[PDB]
């Protein structure tokens, strides 16, 4: 299971996320929030995102600070063994990262998913 956010509407998918919000049904220019919080001593989780449109930025390798500048995850989380995965189901784009070990300091980042004029961003917070 993926501890992430799913914005796609395809009922058939080989991936299973912990939170799913259909972005096609929300109002235009409205923004959806999908917060993720990890607070365990040692992590062996896979956190990701399923977006039916485009992703800003190229997420999970470079992330959006919680207009704001784009930083890189490997320096924000400060651990050089973060693994990355991707997949494409038609127009849907799945981007995932697996994290193993502890983290020196509590950190947070954000990733935006935009389809047409609708836009919704998910935030991830990992406490040391």
């Amino acid at each position, epitope marked *: 299971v993926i501890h992430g956010c799913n914005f796609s509407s395809n009922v058939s998918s080989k991936h299973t996320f912990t939170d799913s919000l259909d972005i096609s049904l929300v109002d235009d220019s409205a923004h959806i929030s999908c917060n993720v919080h990890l607070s365990e001593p040692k992590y062996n989780h896979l956190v990701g995102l399923n977006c039916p449109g485009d992703i*800003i930025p190229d997420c999970f390798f470079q992330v959006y600070q919680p207009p704001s500048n784009i930083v890189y995850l490997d320096s924000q989380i400060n651990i050089g063994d973060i693994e990355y995965y991707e997949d494409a189901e038609g127009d849907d*784009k799945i981007k995932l990262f697996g994290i193993v070990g502890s983290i020196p300091k509590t950190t947070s980042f954000t990733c935006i998913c935009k389809k*047409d004029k609708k836009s919704a961003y998910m935030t991830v917070t990992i406490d040391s």
Partner: antibody
Framework: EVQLVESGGGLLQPGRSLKLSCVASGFTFNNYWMSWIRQAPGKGLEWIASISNIGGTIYYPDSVKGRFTISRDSAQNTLYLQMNSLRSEDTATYYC????????????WGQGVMVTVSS | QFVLSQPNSVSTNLGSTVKLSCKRSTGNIGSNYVSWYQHHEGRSPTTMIYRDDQRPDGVPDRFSGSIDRSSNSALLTIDNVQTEDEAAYFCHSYSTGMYIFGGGTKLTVLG
């Protein structure tokens, strides 16, 4: 200021490959999507390829998929377009564009490189 | 996928108001952002309208973007047209994987 200096085209016989280069300046290179726009004599503007901030998302239309290949290099801050097996219908002017994804428009346009394919 | 239709050429006199349409084939034009670009003969294009109506710094206030939902089209309005406006105008819209452009409208100022 923002500048998109493009080069690497010219005249060549059909079948040969050609790699266009576009050096970008005046903005953080790995923070903005980029694209290539083609304009043929009398056919208007036509989008051909698009790459994301660091290549996380690649886009082509169903008309030049597999034959063209867009690329990006951060160490040189350069956007590349490899056009293999050039055909007569590929003769056109090519521009490289820095677009803003959150607004769906091309913010800055390149200089312009003519590519002529003829036997 | 959709197709953006534009008239080939329109002729307007100096000091008048011109409106350039941009009708969409399938889908509502209000769902996706519409952009307007000016392309001069022998020069690179410049952005005229980036969002549906917003124009960037450097474009004169006489240029305006609007969306006519009654006919499912996008209108580019130019008041007090000058001689420098004789160029091609292109209508653009993106729709998840494809960047659809318009046919192009050769604006000719009648001097």
């Amino acid at each position: 200021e923002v500048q998109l200096v493009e080069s690497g085209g010219g005249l060549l016989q059909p079948g040969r490959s050609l790699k266009l280069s576009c050096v970008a300046s005046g903005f953080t290179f790995n923070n903005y999507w980029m694209s290539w726009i083609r304009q043929a004599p009398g056919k208007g503007l036509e989008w051909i390829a698009s790459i994301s901030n660091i290549g996380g998302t690649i886009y082509y239309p169903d008309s030049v998929k597999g034959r063209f290949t867009i690329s990006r290099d951060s160490a040189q801050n350069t956007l590349y377009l490899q056009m293999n097996s050039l055909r007569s219908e590929d003769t056109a002017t090519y521009y490289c564009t820095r677009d803003l994804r959150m607004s769906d428009y091309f913010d800055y346009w390149g200089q312009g490189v003519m590519v002529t394919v003829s036997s | 996928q959709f197709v953006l239709s534009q008239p080939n050429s329109v002729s307007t006199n100096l000091g008048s108001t011109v409106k350039l349409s941009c009708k969409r084939s399938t889908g509502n034009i209000g769902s996706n952002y519409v952009s307007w670009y000016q392309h001069h003969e022998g020069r690179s294009p410049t952005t005229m309208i980036y969002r549906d109506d917003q124009r960037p710094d450097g474009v004169p206030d006489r240029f305006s973007g609007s969306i006519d939902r009654s006919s499912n089209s996008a209108l580019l309005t130019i008041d007090n047209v000058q001689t420098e406006d004789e160029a091609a105008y292109f209508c653009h819209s993106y729709s998840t994987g494809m960047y659809i452009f318009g046919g192009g409208t050769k604006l000719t100022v009648l001097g």
